[PDB]
């Protein structure tokens, strides 16, 4: 069953999304989002985008670390809930996992499912291309074309980031 | 379509129904926002890498940048809240009901 | 002298008055010139001379 | 194929060194040894209290700066394009905007710690 | 706030709205929306009181959810079309998600909950800037994707917004909540006629912007926030009472004022397509907006409410505020009916 | 509506086809009404600042009515151009598709039959 | 909800009372479910039992109104041999209004609901007869 | 004989946060005049550390 490797990684992806979207406590939500980011970078690395996966992994690890510092600082409780300390959190986690595995079982039986779009049941390895790409990877040249072509995108993004820095300075002032 | 598309869309819907029902904590909603952003990023780069649209590879990473352009902003909208009240509960944000 | 303090509009602002009069005169002569050239070019196009 | 094998091997070697460290020796657990350590005296309060941070502004600045320099990472590959003047101008503009943002943070006393 | 930083932030807001208006790429639309939200957040945090923090938090959460839905619909359209041209969509689910996102961005009911609270928690300058300028980009995006919106969804949203705004405007004494509910009702009025002829939608947008700006600027000049100070305004300057009376009579859709300009012609576009029940219901519901406008005029101008002793000192100090374009804006909002075919320039 | 018509040459206030139309006269009644709007604006500007409304700032009222006349004249030019475009497009489509707009006979009242409903 | 209205409207009037009554009951139950869902969303009940009691009460009230309206309309259409006549729908609307008054345990609400829902049902039958459109497909 | 003009009874109806009060809208105080609330300073909870003998 090694041909469904991306499908298994996506199953772990939705599992982690169910794990942190039930909102037990932001520490374990951060752990679930770290796991989800890892399997997501694995998925996009399996599709060939190694640079994009490594970049999103690094960015979300840094963001989740700053988040963890914030929740240790500010959003804390005397008795944090791991997953089973609250009935509603454990309940919604259980139904999320149950719905995910029900969808897995249904798509693994007749190889077809209808949830609002229509989806197949075969592994994604069919939709790959059969030819080679020469002496370059397409994603690397595509992101490297940001400076040679996307001047407007670079300008508006740099202005947005500078304005964001100014906004962060202005909001947390107090007077 | 395929299968991983279905799984990523299911993850997006899971994070959406996680976001829309708050649990008296702002950081959890911010984590849900980051999760939906991650799911959108993964779906976009999956479609782009499948369809060999190379010139759109500038799209997702640039997209990821604007994630912080709200996400860090959300943290800056929390500290004043955590200076107004001792905690960050969303039930304390009910002064604008009159 | 009546007021115990100097009003900010006690004397007319001469530069503002001159700017207003110049702007009004320039706009009037520009509109007249534009209308004259418009009606002349309209008569040229249709040949209604 | 090899990367997950290496990951599983290292994970197995790490996780075997605790079950060896647990089930091997003679254990003697009472309700005085496993108390939290606070230099011989019992602590006041809990360790789950709000730990009021000071460098929140620099944390948000790092949140922006990590990805705003991650935009600068394809600059090696961007040296291989035919159009070079535009690439050089855009890269210099990006790092100049980074420097302007850092200088604005520095001048407005944003890097200093609160209280 | 430093004036240089304020000018830079306002220019960033204008640049974001312009970027949404002039771009031919969906990613640029989303980038402009994000820049607009990021640069419009600290305007509401101008005075640094807690109510600004609640208003900013609620606005940020709603706008972030709307932006997420917009980007999801954009990605689905990319999947089903393989392009990025800002035009009609090729998936009904993407059209539904974009309509929901733009309804949340416009504050249209049943996504109207944040509008009166955000409007009440922020000053009058940020409130005017929000309720007038921030309602330009989503209307342009709705203008661009005209052959894609489901008719039933947008019509249900319009009638729901009109009814909910008309019902909600009755039970308010704060002026900002009244303006927010009026904005919701006008939002429903503009999106009711969008699929038939968007020139009437642009006309209604221009008229609504002019009247809302006039009312907000009169509120600046009188320095009023509640109904009681607006009533008290008759002692300081009766000309302001005359101006707010004729303006509130204009916004009630009463001829021969310019507020009868959009609505009437909106009806003129619904009967040509054989829809007679909906404009009748919409006018009957706009009677409620006329009702609380009449209540405001009764409190303010047509009756002489009691005042206090200290207002005597305010008789010795004339107004020195920068009432920018107020007489021109009042004249435009009141006496624009006989120039009705001017709207032909909007085609 | 005419958006595709404004597709090849966008962001033009008055194209090259707008100059073949007769410009509005300076004695147009709509232009006089817009000048009266400017005069009303000048009166309100004098009134809201506690000035004598018929004497204070004659240059201000003159600039008000001048700017109003300028903008109104250009807007009226654009409106006339757009209505000419509408009529031209309608007549061109009527001429281009004769089968979709067939002529109908004009029966005299000696041939057509109308039911009579008495009032009594 | 498109299939429910189409299921109710394709049954001939005054022919099968039970299927029409069941379809009207389903329509009323769906509307009551929507109303109760919004009620328990915006106004939080103090307990789960109170919430499910309110949901059941709203659904039962709306289902009873719809069932009695459909039964009375079909009975009137069978008794009068006038299937395409709005007066049967007026009678059914007044019967539903009396049901609403009985459920609310008041008389003035029953009379007002009779009048207004009879006018609304007569207007609905009028629009179905004349082919009126409420959400008109744009054509010009 | 004079023209009737409103007193404090007619003017005090609009002085509330809502026009028609209900059971739910019973504790709804009006907003402050300057919209600036008192800071409601809670206990800051400075953490107590035992720099102990060991
Ligand atoms: C990477 C570096 C580390 C590598 C792995 C470790 C290398 C060394 C492995 C062997 C170490 C010695 C045995 C485990 C430690 C025992 C410590 C001790 O004192 O145990 C006392 C105890 C005996 O004490 P006891 O059972 O009499 O209990 C006394 C305490 N009361 C009465 C209060 C309960 O030993 C054991 O329990 C058994 C130890 C192993 C005996 C031999 C097993 C088979 C070996 C072949
Ligand atoms: C002052 C209090 C009392 C006020 C009473 C006012 C009049 C009462 C009736 C008004 C009905 C609404 C206007 C109808 C105009 C019809 C024009 C027309 O072409 O009709 C033919 C058109 C025909 O449709 P069509 O023309 O689209 O279709 C082509 C023609 N056929 C049908 C042959 C294919 O009729 C309609 O479209 C429907 C007309 C009925 C509308 C019912 C909904 C409104 C109900 C009344 C609400 C009144 C206000 C209540 C609140 C008052 C304030 C408290
Ligand atoms: C509960 C807590 C967690 C408990 C479990 C912890 C497990 C270990 C966690 C630490 C390791 C995380 C690893 C995350 C993914 C790293 C990807 C990587 O290392 O990629 C390197 C390399 C990219 O090089 P590339 O350019 O693709 O070369 C191809 C041309 N020769 O890639 C290659 O050359 C491709 C090699 C095969 C790749 C297969 C697809 C990815 C496999 C991912 C496995 C699962 C990762 C889970 C991470 C969880 C993190 C919390
Ligand atoms: C269809 C829409 C709903 C999808 C999920 C349905 C099952 C799980 C929820 C059941 C109802 C409980 C619930 O959501 O309660 C609201 C709760 C916040 O309430 P709280 O303050 O925790 O406690 C007071 C009363 N519960 O808020 C929460 O529990 C929020 C957590 C929701 C997590 C949803 C994601 C899991 C997967 C759902 C399917 C996709
Ligand atoms: C056009 C050139 C390229 C410009 C863009 C690229 C820049 C690359 C480097 C980026 C630097 C980022 C950070 C800059 C911060 C400057 C503002 C600042 O913090 O000034 C403070 C400092 C005085 O220190 P103090 O106030 O005590 O600081 C608090 C704690 N130390 O103030 C100072 O020490 C004075 C700083 C300003 C004067 C510097 C003069 C340098 C001259 C070098 C030789 C000539 C170079 C000619 C080029 C033009 C220079 C303007
Ligand atoms: C089909 C698409 C059509 C698009 C048309 C676009 C037209 C141009 C853009 C119009 C949109 C609104 C622009 C202005 C937004 C609000 C600006 C604002 O609030 O400025 C604040 C300023 C404060 O002044 P001050 O009293 O000194 O300060 C108090 C302390 N805060 O000042 C004020 O509070 C006073 C008000 C200043 C601005 C009034 C005039 C501009 C807005 C009304 C439009 C007037 C008619 C011109 C445009 C017609 C078409 C809309
Ligand atoms: C005083 C107005 C001054 C206008 C100067 C010229 C501005 C301009 O270039 O306007 C172009 C625009 C028509 O351009 P078009 O491409 O047709 O726009 C489609 C819009 N849906 O022209 C127009 O939109 C004309 C109407 C503008 C009205 C603005 C105030 C209300
Ligand atoms: C007092 C307050 C102030 C004044 C308010 C206005 C009062 C005057 C207006 C209402 C007067 C009573 C209703 C009108 C009675 C006369 C016309 C009429 O409806 O007759 C009953 C009608 C007879 O049948 P027939 O006329 O043949 O119907 C086919 C023609 N369309 O019967 C039928 O067609 C069957 C029943 C049809 C539905 C009737 C109810 C809804 C329509 C009317 C409202
Ligand atoms: C019948 C009946 O008993 O009506 C009384 C009812 C109030 O019932 P209750 O007061 O409890 O006895 O009263 C009601 O239900 C309210 C009135 C019922 C409808 C009256 C309709 C005619 C009204 C006068 C119209 C004049 C024109
Ligand atoms: C005061 C308020 C007055 C309201 C008057 C409404 C009049 C009825 C309008 C809707 C209607 O019944 O239209 C007739 C239509 C049947 O005709 P047709 O379009 O052929 O239906 C097949 C579906 N394509 O019917 C349908 O298409 C299905 C039925 C629609 C019913 C809409 C109203 C339901 C009840 C109120 C909510």
Alpha carbon distance F31, F56 (integer Å): 25
Structure tokens of G41?
Answer: 């969303």
DSSP string, F38-106: HHHHHHHHHHHTT--TTTS-HHHHHHHHHHHHHHHHHHHHHHHHHHHHHHHHHHHHHHH-TTTS-----
Option in H29, H39, H40 nearest B98 (CB) = H29
* Beta bridge mates, A23: none
Compare all CA atoms of chain D with the CA of B68 and give the residue at the minimum distance.
D64
Structure tokens of E119?
Answer: 């409007």
Q: Which of D81, D99, F71, B6 lies closest to A113 in space, CA to CA? A: B6
CA E314 to chain centre: 33
Instruction: List, in order, residues 6 or more apart from B80 with CB less than 8 Å away.
Output: A171, A172, A174, E45, E53
Instruction: List, in order, residues 6 or more apart from C39 with CB less than 8 Å away.
Output: F22, F23
Query: With contact defined as beta carbons under 8 Å apart, do G83 and G12 qualify?
Result: yes
Question: Is residue F116 domain-resident?
Answer: no
Report the 10 Å Cβ neighbour count for E289.
24
Runs of H (alpha helix) within chain G: 2-9, 17-42, 48-80, 86-104, 108-130
Q: Which of A173, D109, H30, D53 lies closest to E49 in space, CA to CA? A: A173
Q: Which helix (H) or strand (E) holds E189?
A: helix E175-192
Q: Which of E304, E249, E222 lies closest to H10 in space, CA to CA? A: E304
3-state secondary structure chain B: CCCHHHHHHHHHHHHHHHHHCCCCCHHHHHHHHHHHHHHHHHHHHHHHHHHCCHHHHHHHHHHHHHHHHHHHHHHHHHHHHHHHCCCCCCCCCCCCCC
Alpha carbon distance G47, G140 (integer Å): 54
Residue F21 DSSP one-character state: S
Residue count of chain F, please give it. Answer: 120
Q: Is B38 exposed, middle or buried (CB count within 10 Å of its CB: 0-12, 13-18, 19+)?
A: buried
Option in F23, F59, F70 nearest C21 (CB) = F59
Query: With contact defined as beta carbons under 8 Å apart, do E183 and E212 qualify?
Result: yes
Query: With contact defined as beta carbons under 8 Å apart, do G58 and G100 qualify?
Result: no
Question: Is residue F119 domain-resident?
Answer: no
Peptide bond into A43 cis (omega under 30): no
E-G C-beta contacts closer than 8 Å = 29
What is the residue with the minimal CA distance to atom 21 of ligand 9?
A: G111
Ligand that lies nearest to the alpha carbon of residue G134, given by its number in the listed order: 10
Regarding the beta carbon of D106 and ligand 5, being less than 6 Å apart is answered: yes
Q: Which of E305, E307, E223, E207 lies closest to E264 in space, CA to CA? A: E207
Q: Which CATH architecture group holds D1-108?
A: Up-down Bundle (1.20)
Strands A112-115 and A117-120: antiparallel
Residue E183: give the domain boundaries.
1-347
Instruction: List, in order, residues 6 or more apart from E212 with CB less than 8 Å away.
Output: E128, E131, E132, E179, E182, E183
Which of E42, E53, E59, E97 is the best mutation test for A, with the most CBs of A within 10 A? Answer: E42
Degrees to nearest 5, angle at CA E118 with E113 and E119: 105
Compare all CA atoms of chain E with the CA of B16 and give the residue at the minimum distance.
E65
Residue count of chain G, please give it. Answer: 140
Please name the chains neighbouring D, where neighbouring means 3+ C-beta pairs under 8 angstroms: A, B, H
Query: With contact defined as beta carbons under 8 Å apart, do E184 and E161 qualify?
Result: yes
G and E make contact (3+ CB pairs below 8 Å): yes
Q: Does G81 touch chain E (CB under 8 A)?
A: no
Report the 10 Å Cβ neighbour count for G78.
15
Ligand that lies nearest to the alpha carbon of residue D27, given by its number in the listed order: 1
Please name the chains neighbouring G, where neighbouring means 3+ C-beta pairs under 8 angstroms: E
Residue A80 DSSP one-character state: -
How far A175 CA lies from chain B's nearest CA (Å)? Answer: 11
DSSP string, G18-35: HHHHHHHHHHHHHHHHHH
Q: Is F25 exposed, middle or buried (CB count within 10 Å of its CB: 0-12, 13-18, 19+)?
A: exposed
CATH of region B1-86: 1.10.287.3510
Instruction: List, in order, residues 6 or more apart from E129 with CB less than 8 Å away.
Output: E13, E40, E43
Instruction: List, in order, residues 6 or more apart from E283 with CB less than 8 Å away.
Output: E253, E263, E267
**In Å, what is the CA distance from E310 to each residue of E222, E235, E315, E316?**
16, 11, 9, 11
Regarding the beta carbon of D13 and ligand 1, being less than 6 Å apart is answered: no
Ligand that lies nearest to the alpha carbon of residue F81, given by its number in the listed order: 7
Structure tokens of A24?
Answer: 């037990």
Q: Which of A127, A96, A122, A95 lies closest to A108 in space, CA to CA? A: A122
* Beta bridge mates, A120: A112
Looking at beta carbons, which pairs linking B78-83 to residues 24 or more positions away fall under 8 Å?
A: B78/A70, B78/A74, B78/A75, B78/B26, B78/B27, B78/B30, B79/A74, B79/A172, B79/D56, B80/A171, B80/A172, B80/A174, B80/E45, B80/E53, B81/B26, B81/E53, B81/E57, B82/A74, B83/A174
Report the 10 Å Cβ neighbour count for A43.
26
* Beta bridge mates, E174: E226
> Which residues of chain F have a CB within 8 Å of the CB of E221?
48
Query: In total, how many domains does chain E have?
Result: 1
Query: With contact defined as beta carbons under 8 Å apart, do E266 and E279 qualify?
Result: yes
Query: Which residue in this structure is represented by tokens 């791991």?
Result: A82
What is the residue with the minimal CA distance to atom 29 of ligand 10?
A: G5
A114: three-class secondary structure by DSSP: strand
Option in B16, B73, B96 nearest E60 (CB) = B73
Report the 10 Å Cβ neighbour count for G102.
16
Query: With contact defined as beta carbons under 8 Å apart, do A158 and D94 qualify?
Result: yes
Query: With contact defined as beta carbons under 8 Å apart, do B69 and E38 qualify?
Result: yes
Option in E272, E276, E278 nearest G140 (CB) = E272
D48: three-class secondary structure by DSSP: coil
For helices E26-44 and E50-81, give the axis angle rounded to 10 degrees.
Answer: 180
Alpha carbon distance G140, B19 (integer Å): 43
Q: Which helix (H) or strand (E) holds A119?
A: strand A117-120
Q: Residue G87 Cα, ligand 8 centroid: separation in angstroms?
A: 10
Each domain of chain B, given as residue ranges in start order, spans 1-86
Alpha carbon distance D58, B72 (integer Å): 11
Alpha carbon distance A144, D74 (integer Å): 6
Degrees to nearest 5, angle at CA E152 with E146 and E158: 80
Compare all CA atoms of chain H with the CA of D38 and give the residue at the minimum distance.
H50
| CA atoms within a 13 Å half-sphere pointing along the CA-CB vector of E150 | 14
Q: Does D106 touch chain B (CB under 8 A)?
A: no
| CA atoms within a 13 Å half-sphere pointing along the CA-CB vector of B8 | 26
Question: Is residue F120 domain-resident?
Answer: no
Regarding the beta carbon of D107 and ligand 5, being less than 6 Å apart is answered: yes
Residue F51: give the domain boundaries.
1-97
For helices E151-168 and E277-300, give the axis angle rounded to 10 degrees.
Answer: 20
Q: Residue A139 Cα, ligand 3 centroid: separation in angstroms?
A: 18
Output phi, psi for E124, to 5 deg.
-70, -35
Output phi, psi for G116, to 5 deg.
-70, -40
How far D18 CA lies from chain A's nearest CA (Å)? Answer: 21
Query: With contact defined as beta carbons under 8 Å apart, do B16 and E73 qualify?
Result: no
> Which domains does chain A carry?
4-171 (1.20.120.1200)
> Which residues of chain H have a CB within 8 Å of the CB of E305?
5-6, 10-11
Q: Is G18 exposed, middle or buried (CB count within 10 Å of its CB: 0-12, 13-18, 19+)?
A: exposed
Q: Which experimental technique did the depositors report for determining this structure?
A: cryo-EM
């Amino acid at each position: 069953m090694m041909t469904y490797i991306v499908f298994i990684l996506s199953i772990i992806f939705v599992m982690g999304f169910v794990g942190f979207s039930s909102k037990p406590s932001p520490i374990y939500g951060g752990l679930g989002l770290i796991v989800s980011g890892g399997v997501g970078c694995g998925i996009v690395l399996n599709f060939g985008g190694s640079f994009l996966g490594l970049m999103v992994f690094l960015i979300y690890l840094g963001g989740m670390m700053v988040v963890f510092g914030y929740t240790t600082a500010m959003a804390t409780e005397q008795y944090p809930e791991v997953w089973v300390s609250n009935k509603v959190v454990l309940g919604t986690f259980i139904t999320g996992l149950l719905m995910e595995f029900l969808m897995v079982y249904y798509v693994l039986k007749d190889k077809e499912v209808e949830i609002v779009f229509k989806f197949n049941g075969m592994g994604d390895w069919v939709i790959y291309d059969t030819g080679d790409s020469g002496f370059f990877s397409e994603e690397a040249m595509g992101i490297a074309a940001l400076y040679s072509y996307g001047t407007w995108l670079v300008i508006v993004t740099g202005w947005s980031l500078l304005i964001g820095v100014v906004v962060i300075m202005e909001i947390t002032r107090g007077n | 379509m395929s299968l991983v598309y279905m799984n990523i869309m299911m993850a997006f819907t899971v994070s959406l129904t996680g976001l829309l029902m708050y649990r008296s904590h702002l950081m959890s909603s911010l984590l849900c926002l980051e999760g939906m952003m991650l799911s959108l990023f993964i779906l976009a780069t999956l479609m782009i890498l499948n369809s060999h649209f190379t010139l759109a590879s500038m799209m997702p990473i640039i997209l990821l940048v604007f994630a912080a352009c709200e996400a860090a902003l959300g943290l800056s909208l929390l500290v004043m809240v955590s200076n107004t009240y001792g905690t960050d509960y969303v039930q304390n944000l009910n002064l604008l009901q009159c | 002298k009546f007021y115990i303090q100097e009003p900010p509009h006690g004397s007319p602002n001469w530069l503002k008055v001159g700017l207003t009069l110049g702007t009004s005169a320039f706009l009037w002569i520009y509109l007249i010139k534009q209308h004259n050239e418009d009606v002349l070019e309209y008569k040229r196009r249709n040949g209604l001379e | 194929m090899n990367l997950m094998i290496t990951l599983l091997t290292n994970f197995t070697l790490a996780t075997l060194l605790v079950t060896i460290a647990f089930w091997l020796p003679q254990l003697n657990v009472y309700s005085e040894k496993t108390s939290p350590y606070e230099c011989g005296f019992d602590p006041m309060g809990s360790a789950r209290l709000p730990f009021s941070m000071k460098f929140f502004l620099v944390a948000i600045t790092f949140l922006l700066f990590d990805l705003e320099i991650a935009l600068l990472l394809p600059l090696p590959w961007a040296s291989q394009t035919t159009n070079l003047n535009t690439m050089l101008t855009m890269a210099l503009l990006l790092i100049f905007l980074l420097a302007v943002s850092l200088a604005y943070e520095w001048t407005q006393k944003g890097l200093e710690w609160t209280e | 706030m430093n004036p240089i930083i304020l000018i830079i932030i306002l220019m960033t807001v204008m640049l974001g709205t312009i970027i949404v208006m002039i771009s031919t790429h969906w990613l640029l639309i989303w980038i402009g929306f994000e820049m607009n939200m990021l640069a419009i957040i600290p305007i509401m945090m101008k005075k640094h009181n807690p109510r600004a923090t609640e208003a900013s938090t609620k606005y940020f959460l709603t706008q972030s959810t709307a932006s997420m839905l917009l980007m999801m619909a954009i990605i689905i359209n990319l999947m089903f079309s393989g392009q990025w041209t800002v035009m009609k969509l090729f998936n009904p689910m993407a059209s539904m998600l974009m309509t929901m996102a733009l309804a949340m961005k416009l504050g249209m009911a049943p996504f109207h909950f944040w509008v009166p609270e955000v409007t009440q928690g922020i000053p009058l300058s940020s409130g005017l800037i929000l309720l007038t300028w921030q309602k330009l980009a989503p209307m342009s995006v709705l203008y661009q994707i005209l052959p894609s919106i489901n008719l039933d969804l947008i019509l249900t949203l319009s009638i729901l917004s009109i009814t909910i705004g008309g019902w909600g405007g009755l039970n308010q004494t704060q002026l900002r909540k009244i303006m927010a509910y009026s904005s919701i009702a006008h939002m429903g009025w503009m999106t009711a006629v969008l699929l038939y002829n968007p020139t009437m939608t642009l006309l209604n947008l221009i008229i609504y912007i002019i009247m809302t700006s006039t009312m907000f600027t009169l509120f600046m000049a009188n320095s009023t926030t509640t109904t009681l100070s607006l009533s008290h305004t008759w002692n300081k300057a009766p000309i302001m009472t005359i101006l707010v009376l004729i303006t509130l009579l204009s916004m009630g859709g009463l001829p021969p004022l310019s507020g009868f300009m959009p609505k009437w012609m909106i009806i003129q576009e619904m009967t040509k397509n054989d829809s007679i029940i909906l404009p009748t219901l919409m006018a009957i519901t706009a009677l409620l907006n006329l009702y609380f406008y009449m209540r405001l005029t009764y409190s303010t101008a047509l009756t002489m409410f009691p005042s206090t002793n200290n207002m005597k000192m305010k008789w010795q100090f004339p107004t020195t505020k920068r009432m920018t374009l107020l007489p021109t804006m009042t004249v435009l909002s009141t006496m624009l009916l006989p120039l009705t075919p001017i709207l032909s320039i909007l085609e | 509506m005419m958006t595709g018509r404004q597709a090849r040459a966008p962001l033009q206030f008055l194209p090259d086809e707008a100059r073949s139309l007769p410009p509005p006269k300076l004695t147009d009644p709509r232009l006089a009404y817009i000048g009266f709007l400017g005069y009303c604006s000048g009166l309100i500007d004098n009134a809201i600042r506690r000035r004598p409304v018929l004497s204070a700032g004659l240059h201000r009222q003159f600039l008000y009515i001048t700017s109003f006349v300028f903008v109104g004249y250009y807007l009226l030019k654009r409106q006339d151009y757009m209505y000419a475009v509408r009529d031209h497009d309608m007549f061109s489509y009527i001429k281009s598709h004769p089968e979709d707009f067939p002529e109908k006979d004009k029966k005299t009242y000696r041939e057509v039959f109308e039911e009579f409903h008495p009032v009594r | 909800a498109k299939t429910l209205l189409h299921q109710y409207w394709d049954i001939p009037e005054g022919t099968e009372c039970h299927r029409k009554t069941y379809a009207a009951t389903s329509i009323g139950g769906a509307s009551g479910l929507v109303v109760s869902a919004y009620s328990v969303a915006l106004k939080t009940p103090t307990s789960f039992l109170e919430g499910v009691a309110r949901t059941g009460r709203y659904t039962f009230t709306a289902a009873a109104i719809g069932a009695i309206f459909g039964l009375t309309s079909c009975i009137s259409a069978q008794v009068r041999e006038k299937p395409d006549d709005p007066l049967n729908y007026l009678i059914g609307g007044c019967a539903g209004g009396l049901t609403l008054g009985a459920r609310t345990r008041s008389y003035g609400i029953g009379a007002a609901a009779c009048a207004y829902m009879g006018l609304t049902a007569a207007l609905v039958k009028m629009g179905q007869l004349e082919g009126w459109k409420v959400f008109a497909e744009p054509k010009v | 004989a004079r023209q009737w003009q409103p007193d404090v009874e007619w003017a005090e109806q609009y002085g509330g946060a809502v026009m028609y009060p209900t059971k739910e809208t019973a504790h709804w105080k009006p907003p402050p005049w300057n919209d600036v609330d008192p800071p409601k300073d809670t206990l800051v909870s400075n953490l107590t550390l035992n720099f102990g003998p060991q």
